[PDB]
Structures are given as structure tokens and as C-alpha cells.
Design a protein around this ligand. Structure first.
Ligand code: ACO
Ligand code: ZN
Ligand code: ZN
Ligand code: ZN
Ligand code: ZN
Ligand code: ZN
Lengths: 491, 550, 70, 93, 12, 97
């Protein structure tokens, strides 16, 4: 029933988890359990993040009670002095009245000190069973084994430089609307009660159905981003940016579901830089493991290429790829090039209907780049994975399509997966301009002669179009008027 | 590098401008980390892991619904900032998306009010907010940040039983603590750093400490402080000696990892993540110098992660997390030092053969042992690819090279310093900070707390409002030095003199006069936009009715 | 050892629901590798084998059952 | 009806009149603003004036520059942010 | 002015 | 000796005009390439021009609020340091130079 005893001293106890995990019953029972445990009980086992803090506090206050086996060597002042000028100018001179800066009634003494330590000790069982029990020398090893983000428990992959007291505990709680981490479920409850706005900072530069993309800057939110980096490193192995987050710009993907407040749940992110000379267009990209092969990574990659195209450049990700990056991001190339090939065919069909195949139009890697957004050294990999480029035995390389059926089948099969795609007409964006500081507030090592009064007259030269479809149709029509090569070459 | 990140000019020419002519009638890891030869790694191209799980009981599912008390003054000030726990005014999902994505529902913006203006706030609420903001100047635009703890849940019961008679609530406790730390932040922001007098005092203290107990951090060696990872004393425009402000260590930009110098004040990693509390280096007893986190959070010396042969950095520009502690030699940890005889950390050994006297790196630097980097660079020494290369060289006490003077005085200096440390282990002057540099809150904070308890209307005794002010300076000591509130502002007035502040005010005046003309032009632009919108909207309809009267 | 385990087992059966959950919490808090206890929070079932519990924890459980039963 | 259509012509005329008045006011306001720097730099000798979009203080008290006094029509950004202005500008020039 | 990416190269 | 004062206010002298000109350029693009026969094509364009106009308004008043608060704190710090210097000169006779 409720409790049962066997014949071999194996006792079964059954209870109710809803009551067992309560936040009030926990402290109530901890208060009366904590003195029942003899305070001479030698805890010769491992070192908890709790016991380490308590024992450091005792050793600092110079109290004669010790249980740990690790005596700190320098855990107090090097030279304790009481005649220095620090006690004649109280509070640096920021308060002027003596009745106001006298501290004769606010210095703690042995009695309230001991009472405070008793308050601390009487919570141990509840602090543990809140911070380390899951609802479902050993110091060099981190203990973190879960990350509770929305309501799921996300096993990490690598180790992030979370502070020491967060790494000694084996559960961390993170608030998605704010990206703040705490090591206790009670404190998490308190914080989700206080925190009210359900939106990231920064603007909203895209919206369609549920998905939305917010353009969080780097140097205006130096806490949101500094916590996003620590949440990223637990999944992205090779990354080493955690604090110098000012020269970066973050684009965050949110999924909205609907007090009556609009709830915008974090789904993933990709980063970027404000000025780089390696011709990159992305630094890191991440989707939280709660997906199941849903399309948001290909979405965000298409987005980065749209930004580079609307900026009129070429780019590639930061190169030290991963084994889960490349396996997902060398399919994007194949499908992009298949789409462009079908586009060229269908645009030539409207005029090559009355003609014959005797003429062979001449396509180039720069003319596929300016349509796709990627560089030629990536169009080559696209065509290779598609098995369409031939170095047969002037004509050193050609593009041979044995049957359009295989390619249209490839595209239709990839389209059946119903992934979300980007629509170029819902983007409210304008490529950023950089002054004499390149988007930071810091180092001084161009001159203050920019004055930025241009970018307004750039309507003058009607050549570089502002739209994307205009240049797309230009490349698709103008450069493909050439008379085609006669097919008389080979078989 | 693998065959997806190299180039395409490792093909034959294929210049990509040459024209091509189209016509019609599972795991491939291709190479190694770096330079090598072609190799397939389908066994290393691995992705899967264990699982991920979903919790079955929400946080709000576990809460004692009981409520013993209520407030009788300004309940709206609480119901605004916290979550008013009822069925508040909500909307319907058949209308929400049409209202916030519809034909006239614009995108959001970093300036769009953090409140919801579609709902109304009463006037009693605004009057109460004004009353609260009138308690003290530093209380303008207030918000409860602090979060509740399993020990504060116990302190609250004792306060309710002793003083406030079951009237104080969790929200009011959080508000009291948040006000206390807001006021401490505003008192701390304005502490003037130093002048000539305190500079002379500190430099003389440093020199007179070095003259007796020796030093390692570069302090005391001369009048001008040297670096803290390489003992360098030169500088130039490409990397400068950048001083810190919590401590007073100096560093080279490329020897520490300062990619860019901020315009305000520079704060190192230890005085930025935690506070200057006398931390615990894993590998040596002394804790004073330039520290850097590891892959988990601990704090190791830069002078130690370099010299220990199994320790290296993972990024040579930032010098980010020290790595490789989990594979240090058991013999390395079983060795024990010979100058301080302490039984903690990991040591290095002498160089000359037939000698096995070990010592910590910082104890060696304090004593005065010969250490020379050689012809290597800091970056190569950090990269750990130095193993197949040559080595670095040191010596013990009785193996000093020719000319290296005696260091018996040195080991005596070090032993004396650690002995004094081990002994210290066991016009009205007012003390205003604990020995660990944490604060203690003065009378005015208790006065403010009494005013706030009046505002909310509780039985407030001055003893009850001094108890919390005591407990604050102890909760802020249990934690190490980190402020209890997640908030912080990038402002640092501090070291500014008087004439500099004068010039800053003078320039702020000009910018302030200018932004007004700018705002005038901006509102003119907005009016013009509205005008043209209405014009177009009317013109469309009138041209429609002209082109079709039906 | 000096704790009569048959009497402790006959005494643990004389508690109430919140006292049993107190036993569960007390064991869960402090636990050593040598012991073997099975806690299932997915459905709420606790199983513990006495003969491996150390002396401090046996004494503490004894004090708890004594001052909470009578 | 006929009168229902006719009553919109004067409304259109008044809306275009307001549009042109606002365009002219923005024109005059930025014309005086991009020069008020020079008004503040010419007339304790004041040699620390400028704009927020181009102004600066690297100069000294010994110099007197007029490149801010004489400005071109390719700086009125508040005007160039419109369709009609750029249309008529490219139509005239 | 020197650009440094938010990443680290391969180790060996 | 003294860094150029122009480098202390980089939220206003430097980083504001860039966002201002960027928003004005976005306005111009929408206004120019807006269509005429498309009634929604003009509704969206007017909505976005209004959006960007209120945006630039909020931006230029945020900056002036910041400058006001900065001047206030400058004044307070002036007072504090003028008090601290004399309060230290009071007990100068305690140090050891
Ligand atoms: C610069 C850099 O790249 S470093 C950062 C890259 N590494 C990481 O981000 C680690 C954590 N994040 C991830 O692993 C993510 O998968 C990312 C960032 C690579 C993007 O992937 P996701 O958005 O999660 O999934 P997405 O929907 O985009 O991919 C779908 C396609 O990917 C391929 N594929 C993706 N994952 C797998 C997999 N585990 N196994 C086999 N095939 C896979 C399939 O073609 C799949 O299509 P399918 O549904 O028909 O099978
Ligand atoms: Zn939050
Ligand atoms: Zn150096
Ligand atoms: Zn420091
Ligand atoms: Zn060390
Ligand atoms: Zn030592």
C-alpha cells in the first residue's frame, strides 16, 4: 500500500511527487531535519558547491568549526590594518552628514552572525533537492548535466565557462525571454513571476506567420549577448568568444504562440561581424535541440545569403566547420544550384521553342554566383554534389545534363519536406553604415572626415538597382543573348 | 583542413570567367585537422548522442496556494510590477493575429514602450508611482530586480514573528533589498580613485613590501610597474601596458589578450566576472597576479598555464580558456615543493640532470630562481605545439648558472612571507567596509527603509529596519563580492578631475542645444509623411469614382 | 551495528504520509556510493536496503523515527 | 453623386497645399539648420560650433573656415527622403 | 585595425 | 596630455547619425519603388513610412534624455571630488610619504 517491509530489510515507500516537490513543504521539513543530523558528522566525501561556500564563510569569519579536508592557503586579507586612511573618509566623501554616515548601529556582531549561519545551515536539504534532483580530486570536472530551458531538459555536449558555483551544481535554469541563468527552481519561480515583457530587445526586421527575426545589436545589449554566448558554447565546440561581444551583431529567430501577451519563444540564432576582410558572412549558427529536423537552419542560411545579396557581396561561413554543420550545409548548395539550373532552363524555353539545340548558351560561375549569393569555390561543390560538371576529353570543362528528369525529381523531393522558405518582400531592412568607429565604442588606433552625407544621392546611378529581382532578370536576360556554340563538336 | 574549406584553384585553371555550355537533346570527412595527407574519416563523422526529455509538472504547479495576509496601502503598486495573480483582461485568438499582424499592425521596435498601452492604467496607480519615486532621488524609474532564496524564505519568517506581525510579504522583501542595492550602486559610482597623495602612498607601500618579502607580480621591482606575465617594461603603439582598476596589475595587450581598449576604464577577467576576492589558483598557493578562467570556471595564473607542460590556451588572440588540466601527470601532482613545503597544486622541476628538486612557478619567481623563456614567443609557448620543438629552461637553488647571484636570501624571503600569511590566518574613525572589501550599509539606508515601510503601511520599528540593513552586508559577503542584482551600468565618472568634468558639461550643453533643432526637423518630417499619406488615400478614391461612376 | 535494524524497520511503518516523505528527503539529501537506494520520480516510488546504510545515517533515522512516532 | 465627387476637388487642393507648405517649411528649416553652425561659430570668442551630422572641434582658435558656411544641395537628407523631391530634382537637372 | 573572428582553428 | 573630448560622447556624435541616415534611406527606398496600381502596395508603403518616422522621433528624443542625465551626474561627481580632496587634505598628517 503506502509502506511495506520485506523479509530481507528492503522497505518500499510510495508517495506523491506533486507534494514531494513542493516549495513550501521543502523548507518546512528541512528546518526540522537539519538539526537531527549530528553537526559532528564528518562529511569526508566529495565537495558540494554548497558546503564549499559555507566552509569558506566560516573560515573567513574565523569560526571554530570545520568539516572539509581542503584548507585554503590565502582566504583572507594579506595585511589586516586598522590605522589606514580608509576609515577617516567614510564612503569616499559621498555622504556629508555625520548622523548619516555613522555606522555605529549597522555593524554586525557575533550574535547575528551566528544566527545568520544557522539560517544558512537549516536550508541545506531543500537547497539540494531544489538544485540537484531532476523531475525526469573531482574539481577539474564540471558537474552540469542538464539545462532546463522551456520545460525540457537539454543534455549539453561541451563545457562552457559558467561561474564556479554554477559549474559545481548539476542543473541550470535559463529564462528564454532574457537569457539569465540560476541554479534553483524556487529562484526561477520568483524570477518568472517578476519578469514581464515577452520579447527580445532590438527591432523586428521580418515577419511571416509565426516566424520572426529580431536584429539585436551588439554594443547596446552587452548582457543578453554575453549570456547567449555562454548558452551557445555548450553546443558549439570550437568557439572562443564570450565577453568581447561589441563588434558583433545577432539575428534571432523566434516562434510566436498565443494574460493575453504575445509569447515569442527562442528557436535559434546566427551571428555576424561588422567588418571582416576574409569575405565571410556568418560566424556561428545554432538551433536548440528541441527541433526534429524542421528546416530552421536552412531557413537561417538562406537568410544570411539574402542579406549578403541585398548588400551586393559574396560570402561564406566562418571556415572551421563541424561534422554536423557541413552535413546539413552541403545540401543547401546542391539544392541552390539545382534551382538555378531549372531557372535558366525555364527562362530559355520561352524563346528557344521555335529554335533548335544547335546553339549552346554559355553560362559561367560568376553568373551563377551573382544569382545565388555564394562564391564560385562553393558553386563548384554544388555542381559536384549534383554530378553535372564534366571534364571530358577549347573545351576543358562543360556542364552536361543527361536528363532533366533526375534534377526536377531532386528538387521536387526536397520540396516535399515542407520546409519554411524566405519571402523577399516582407523584409524591412537596409544594410548598416559604419562611422569612424566601425560599430564599437572603444579603441582608437578612419579619420573623422566621413560625414556620411552620401548614401542619399545613390539613386543617381540607375545602374546598380535597389531591388533584387531587377538584377536577377538583368543577369538572366542580358548576358544570355550570345550566339550559341554549334553542337558539331562531339557525340 | 578538409576538402570543403580550401579553394577551387586547386583545380586546373577553370578561372570561373571562362564560359561553360549546358545542353540537352553517406559521410565524407576528407582530410585531417591540418597539413597532412588525404584520409577518410567516416567513423569520426559522427553526430548522435543520448536524448532530450520533457518535464511533466510546471513551476506554477508546485506552490502552496495559502495566503495569510494582505496589504492595506498601494496594492496597485504591487499588482503592476509583479504578476497580478488572477484572470486578467485577455483577448481572443480569433482576433489577436488580425490585430497584431493585420493591415495596420506594424513591426516592433527597441523603442516601443515596454508596457502594453492598449490596456489602461488608473490614476491612483500613477499617483502611487509618483509617491514611491518621491522617497529619494535615486528611486526614479524603479523596478524590483532581486530574486528570492531558500535562506531568505527562512529569514522572512523570523522577521514576521519578531517585528512586522505577519505583514511583510515576499514582494515587499524583494523591494526592500532592491532599494538597498540601488542606493549602494549610486553611492559606489562616485568614489574618487586617487590623487598624488594616494599614488605616492601605494607606490611606497609596494616598494617597502618588496624590500622585505619579495614579489612576483612586477610590483616593487622599480618605480614603474612591469608586466605581470612576462616581466616586461617596454611599450609601443602596437601593444601598450594597460593597467587595471580593481587591482593594479599591468599587462601587455598581446601577452594578456586585450584585443581592444575600452574608452572608459579597463577591468580584467577576475575583477570583471567575480570580484577581487582572494581567489583559489589550482596550481599554486599565492593568489595575486593575472588570472584567466579555465574550461570550467576555475582561476589559473597565466604564468602557470604557460610553464606547466600539459597546459595550453585554446585561442592565441583572446587567450581564452586555459585547457588541459584533466590530463596532468599523477607524478606531477604527487611531487611536493621544496621552498614553501605546502601540499597543494602542481610543480615544475629543475633542469640539470641528476636533480629532482621541484617548486611552484610563483614561489620560484618570488624566491628569485633563474627562469628564461629563451628565443621562443609567448604565443608559441602557449600553443602547446612546443613539445616537438626545443624547450624552456630554469634552475634550482644550487644549480644557478654562472653569475646568477645567491638566492638563499630569496628562499628566506619567500618562507617569511608565507609564514606571516599563515600567522595572519589565525576625526572620529568609522569603519565602512569588511576586510574582504564588501560594504556595510549606513544609517541613511535604514531611514529609506523606514520610509518605504511607511509607504506600504506596516508596523515599522527602527530595530526592525536596522536588522535588514545588517543582514544585507552579510548576504553580500556569503556570495563572494558579486552584487546580488543582475543590474549594472557602464558609467564610470570616478578618476575624472574637476576641469575635465567642466569641459564635459560645456560640450554636453552644445549637443543638448543641437538635438532640439534635430527633433524639430524630425517632427516636421513626420507631419509631412502623414499629409502625403492622406493625400494619396483621397486621390485614389476620387480617381476611382471619376474612372467609374458606378 | 548498535542500531537494531528489525526494530527500526518495524518503527518506520508507524509514520504518516508527510513523515514518510520526510524520510525520503532525508535519505536523498546525504547519500554515499556504497549505499543502494532507488528513487523513481516519474511515478513516485522509493526503495532502500538497510544493511548498507552507514552508522551516522542509521543513528539519524533512528532519532527521527523515535521523536516522530512517540 | 455629382456634388459628392465635386466636393473632393477642393479637398485635394487643400491637401496638396498643406503638402507643399510642409515641404517648403522643411526646406527652409534645414536651410537655416545646416548654417546655424556658422551662425553660432561666427557670433569669449566662440570657435566650437558645428552640426551633429558633420560638426567637430579639432580646429583651433586661429582659423576661420567657410566650408560649413557654403553647403551644397546634396546634404538635405530630410528633403531627399521623399519621392516628389528627387523626381523634380532629376527633372530640373 | 585587425579583424578576429569568433572562433578558433583546428588544433593538431 | 588630454584625449580629444570628442571621443567621450560616441553615442551621439558618432552612432546616432548613422542610424538616422540609414532610416532615412530606407524611407526613400520605400517611397521611390512603391507602386501605384497596387492599393495594398501603397498601404504597406505608407504604413512603413509612418513606422520609420515614429522610429526616428523616438531615437532623437532618447538621445537628449541620455545627455540630460549625463550632465546631472557630471555635476554630482564634481561636487563629490571637490569634497573628497579637502577631506583628505584634512588627515594628510596620517600617511607616510
Ligand atoms: C560555422 C559553423 O558552422 S559552427 C556551428 C555549427 N554546429 C552547430 O550548430 C551544432 C548545434 N546545431 C546543429 O547541429 C544544427 O543542426 C545546425 C546549426 C547545423 C542546423 O541544422 P538544423 O536547423 O537543426 O536542421 P535542418 O532542418 O536545417 O536540416 C535538415 C536536413 O539536414 C540533414 N541532416 C540534418 N541533420 C542530420 C542528421 N543528424 N543526420 C543525418 N542527416 C541530417 C538532412 O538533409 C535533413 O533533411 P531531412 O529532413 O530530409 O533528413
Ligand atoms: Zn527572463
Ligand atoms: Zn607580457
Ligand atoms: Zn583587475
Ligand atoms: Zn597559479
Ligand atoms: Zn610553493
Amino acid at each position: 500500500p503506502n509502506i511495506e517491509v520485506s523479509e530481507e530489510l528492503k522497505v518500499r515507500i510510495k508517495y506523491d511527487s506533486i507534494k514531494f516537490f513542493n516549495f513550501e513543504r521543502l523548507i518546512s521539513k528541512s528546518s526540522v531535519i537539519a538539526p537531527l543530523v549530528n553537526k559532528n558528522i564528518t562529511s569526508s566525501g566529495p565537495l558540494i558547491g554548497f558546503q564549499r561556500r559555507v566552509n569558506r564563510l566560516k573560515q573567513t569569519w574565523d569560526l571554530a568549526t570545520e568539516n572539509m579536508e581542503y584548507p585554503y592557503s590565502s582566504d583572507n586579507t594579506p595585511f589586516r590594518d586598522n590605522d589606514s586612511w580608509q576609515w577617516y573618509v567614510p564612503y569616499g566623501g559621498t555622504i556629508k552628514k555625520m548622523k548619516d554616515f555613522s555606522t555605529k548601529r549597522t555593524l554586525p556582531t557575533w550574535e547575528d552572525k551566528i544566527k545568520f549561519l544557522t539560517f544558512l545551515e537549516n536550508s541545506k536539504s531543500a537547497t539540494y533537492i531544489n538544485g540537484n534532483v531532476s523531475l525526469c580530486n573531482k574539481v577539474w570536472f564540471s558537474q552540469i548535466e542538464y539545462i532546463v530551458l522551456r520545460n525540457y531538459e537539454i543534455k549539453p555536449w561541451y563545457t562552457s565557462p559558467f561561474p564556479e558555483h554554477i559549474n559545481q551544481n548539476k542543473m541550470v535554469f535559463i529564462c528564454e525571454f532574457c537569457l539569465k541563468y540560476m541554479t534553483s527552481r524556487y529562484t526561477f519561480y520568483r524570477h518568472q513571476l517578476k519578469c514581464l515583457t515577452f520579447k527580445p530587445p532590438g527591432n523586428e526586421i521580418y515577419r511571416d506567420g509565426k516566424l520572426s527575426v529580431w536584429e539585436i545589436d551588439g554594443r547596446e545589449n552587452v548582457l543578453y549577448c554575453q549570456n547567449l554566448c555562454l548558452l551557445a558554447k555548450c553546443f558549439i565546440n570550437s568557439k572562443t568568444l564570450y565577453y568581447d561581444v561589441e563588434p558583433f551583431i545577432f539575428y534571432i529567430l523566434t516562434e510566436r504562440e498565443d494574460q493575453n501577451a504575445a509569447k515569442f519563444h527562442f528557436v535559434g540564432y546566427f551571428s555576424k561581424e561588422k567588418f571582416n576582410s576574409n569575405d565571410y558572412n556568418l560566424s556561428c549558427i545554432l538551433t536548440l535541440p528541441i527541433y526534429q529536423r524542421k528546416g530552421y537552419g536552412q531557413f537561417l542560411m538562406e537568410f544570411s545569403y539574402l542579406l549578403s545579396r541585398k548588400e551586393s557581396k559574396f560570402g561564406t561561413p566562418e571556415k572551421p566547420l563541424s561534422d554536423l554543420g557541413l552535413l546539413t550545409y552541403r545540401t543547401f548548395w546542391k539544392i541552390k544550384c539545382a534551382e538555378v539550373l531549372l531557372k535558366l532552363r525555364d527562362s530559355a524555353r520561352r524563346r528557344s521553342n521555335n529554335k533548335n539545340e544547335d546553339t549552346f548558351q554559355q553560362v559561367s560561375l560568376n553568373d551563377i554566383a551573382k544569382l545565388t549569393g555564394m562564391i564560385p569555390t562553393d558553386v563548384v561543390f554544388g555542381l559536384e554534389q549534383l554530378q553535372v560538371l564534366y571534364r571530358h576529353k577549347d573545351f576543358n570543362y562543360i556542364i552536361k545534363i543527361d536528363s532533366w528528369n533526375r534534377i526536377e525529381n531532386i528538387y521536387k523531393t526536397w520540396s516535399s519536406k515542407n520546409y519554411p522558405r524566405v519571402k523577399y518582400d516582407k523584409l524591412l531592412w537596409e544594410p548598416i553604415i559604419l562611422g569612424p568607429s566601425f560599430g564599437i565604442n572603444g579603441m582608437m588606433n578612419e579619420d573623422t572626415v566621413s560625414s556620411l552625407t552620401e548614401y542619399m544621392c545613390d539613386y543617381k546611378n540607375t545602374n546598380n538597382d535597389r531591388l533584387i529581382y531587377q538584377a536577377e532578370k538583368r543577369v538572366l536576360e542580358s548576358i544570355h543573348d550570345r550566339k550559341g556554340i554549334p553542337r558539331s563538336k562531339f557525340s | 583542413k578538409l576538402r570543403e574549406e580550401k579553394h577551387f584553384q586547386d583545380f586546373y585553371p577553370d578561372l570561373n570567367a571562362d564560359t561553360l555550355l549546358p545542353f540537352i537533346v553517406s559521410v565524407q570527412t576528407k582530410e585531417l585537422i591540418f597539413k597532412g595527407r588525404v584520409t577518410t574519416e567516416p567513423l569520426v563523422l559522427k553526430k548522435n548522442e543520448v536524448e532530450f526529455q520533457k518535464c511533466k509538472i510546471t513551476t506554477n504547479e508546485l506552490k502552496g496556494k495559502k495566503n495569510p495576509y494582505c496589504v492595506r496601502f498601494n496594492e496597485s503598486f504591487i499588482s503592476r510590477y509583479y504578476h497580478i495573480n488572477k484572470v486578467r483582461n485577455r483577448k481572443s485568438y480569433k482576433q489577436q493575429q488580425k490585430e497584431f499582424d493585420g493591415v495596420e499592425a506594424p513591426y516592433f521596435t527597441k523603442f516601443s514602450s515596454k508596457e502594453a498601452p492598449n490596456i489602461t492604467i488608473s490614476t491612483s496607480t500613477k499617483s502611487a508611482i509618483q509617491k514611491f519615486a518621491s522617497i529619494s532621488p535615486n528611486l526614479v524609474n524603479f523596478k524590483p530586480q532581486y530574486d528570492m532564496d531558500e535562506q531568505d524564505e527562512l529569514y522572512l519568517h523570523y522577521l514576521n514573528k519578531r517585528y512586522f506581525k505577519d505583514q511583510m510579504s515576499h514582494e515587499i522583501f524583494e523591494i526592500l533589498m532592491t532599494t538597498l542595492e540601488t542606493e549602494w550602486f549610486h553611492i559606489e559610482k562616485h568614489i574618487p580613485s586617487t590623487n598624488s597623495l594616494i599614488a605616492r602612498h601605494n607606490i611606497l607601500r609596494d616598494c617597502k613590501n618588496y624590500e622585505l618579502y619579495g614579489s612576483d607580480d612586477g610590483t616593487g621591482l622599480s618605480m614603474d610597474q612591469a608586466c605581470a606575465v612576462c616581466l616586461g617594461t617596454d611599450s609601443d603603439n602596437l601593444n601598450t601596458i594597460v593597467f587595471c582598476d580593481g587591482c593594479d596589475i599591468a599587462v601587455h595587450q598581446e601577452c594578456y589578450g586585450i584585443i581592444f581598449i575600452p574608452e572608459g576604464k579597463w577591468l580584467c577577467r577576475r575583477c570583471m566576472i567575480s570580484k577581487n576576492n582572494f581567489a583559489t589558483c589550482l596550481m599554486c598557493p599565492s593568489h595575486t597576479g593575472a588570472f584567466k578562467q579555465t574550461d570550467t570556471g576555475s582561476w589559473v595564473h597565466n604564468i602557470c598555464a604557460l610553464w606547466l607542460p600539459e597546459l595550453y590556451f585554446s585561442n592565441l588572440h583572446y587567450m581564452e580558456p586555459i585547457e588541459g588540466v584533466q590530463n596532468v601527470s599523477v607524478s606531477r601532482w604527487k611531487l611536493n615543493c621544496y621552498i614553501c613545503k605546502k601540499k597543494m597544486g602542481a610543480c615544475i622541476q629543475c633542469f640539470q640532470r641528476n636533480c629532482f628538486t621541484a617548486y611552484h612557478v610563483t614561489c620560484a619567481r618570488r624566491a628569485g630562481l633563474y627562469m628564461s623563456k629563451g628565443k621562443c614567443t609567448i604565443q608559441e609557448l602557449a600553443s602547446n605545439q612546443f613539445s616537438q620543438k626545443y624547450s624552456v629552461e630554469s634552475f634550482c637553488h644550487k644549480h644557478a648558472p654562472r653569475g646568477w647571484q645567491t638566492s638563499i636570501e630569496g628562499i628566506n624571503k619567500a618562507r617569511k612571507y608565507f609564514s606571516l600569511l599563515s600567522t595572519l590566518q589565525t576625526f572620529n574613525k568609522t569603519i565602512w567596509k569588511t576586510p574582504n572589501q564588501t560594504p556595510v550599509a549606513p544609517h541613511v539606508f535604514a531611514e529609506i527603509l523606514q520610509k518605504v515601510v511607511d509607504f506600504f503601511g506596516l508596523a515599522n520599528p527602527p530595530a526592525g529596519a536596522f536588522d535588514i540593513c545588517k543582514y544585507w552586508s552579510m548576504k553580500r559577503e556569503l556570495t563572494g563580492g558579486t552584487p546580488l542584482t543582475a543590474c549594472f551600468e557602464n558609467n564610470s565618472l570616478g578618476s575624472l578631475t574637476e576641469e575635465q568634468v567642466q569641459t564635459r558639461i560645456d560640450f554636453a550643453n552644445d549637443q543638448l542645444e543641437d538635438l532640439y533643432r534635430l527633433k524639430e526637423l524630425t517632427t516636421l518630417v513626420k507631419k509631412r509623411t502623414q499629409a502625403s499619406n492622406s493625400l494619396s488615400r483621397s486621390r485614389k478614391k476620387v480617381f476611382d469614382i471619376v474612372k467609374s461612376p458606378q | 551495528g548498535s542500531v537494531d535494524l528489525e526494530k527500526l524497520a518495524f518503527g518506520l511503518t508507524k509514520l504518516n504520509e508527510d513523515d514518510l516523505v520526510g524520510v525520503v528527503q532525508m535519505v536523498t539529501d546525504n547519500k554515499t556510493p556504497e549505499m543502494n537506494v532507488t528513487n523513481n520520480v516519474e511515478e513516485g516510488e522509493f526503495i532502500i536496503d538497510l544493511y548498507s546504510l552507514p552508522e551516522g545515517l542509521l543513528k539519524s533515522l533512528w532519532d527521527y523515527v523515535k521523536k516522530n512516532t512517540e | 453623386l455629382k456634388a459628392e465627387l465635386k466636393k473632393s476637388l477642393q479637398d485635394r487642393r487643400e491637401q496638396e497645399d498643406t503638402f507643399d507648405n510642409l515641404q517648403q517649411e522643411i526646406y527652409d528649416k534645414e536651410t537655416e539648420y545646416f548654417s546655424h553652425n556658422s551662425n553660432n561659430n561666427h557670433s569669449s570668442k566662440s570657435h566650437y560650433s558645428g552640426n551633429i551630422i558633420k560638426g567637430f572641434d579639432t580646429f583651433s582658435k586661429s582659423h576661420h573656415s567657410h566650408a560649413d558656411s557654403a553647403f551644397n544641395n546634396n546634404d538635405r537628407i530630410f528633403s531627399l527622403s521623399s519621392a516628389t523631391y528627387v523626381k523634380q530634382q532629376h527633372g530640373q537637372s | 585595425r585587425k579583424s578576429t573572428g569568433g572562433m578558433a582553428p583546428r588544433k593538431q | 596630455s588630454d584625449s580629444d573630448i570628442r571621443y567621450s560622447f560616441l553615442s551621439t556624435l558618432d552612432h546616432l547619425p548613422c542610424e538616422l541616415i540609414r532610416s532615412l534611406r530606407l524611407m526613400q527606398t520605400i517611397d521611390l519603388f512603391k507602386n501605384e496600381e497596387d492599393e495594398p502596395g501603397m498601404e504597406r508603403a505608407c504604413r512603413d513610412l509612418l513606422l520609420v518616422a515614429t522610429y526616428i522621433n523616438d531615437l532623437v528624443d532618447d538621445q537628449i534624455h541620455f545627455l540630460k542625465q549625463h550632465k546631472k551626474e557630471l555635476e554630482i561627481q564634481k561636487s563629490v571630488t571637490k569634497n573628497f580632496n579637502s577631506s583628505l587634505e584634512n588627515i594628510k598628517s596620517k600617511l607616510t610619504l
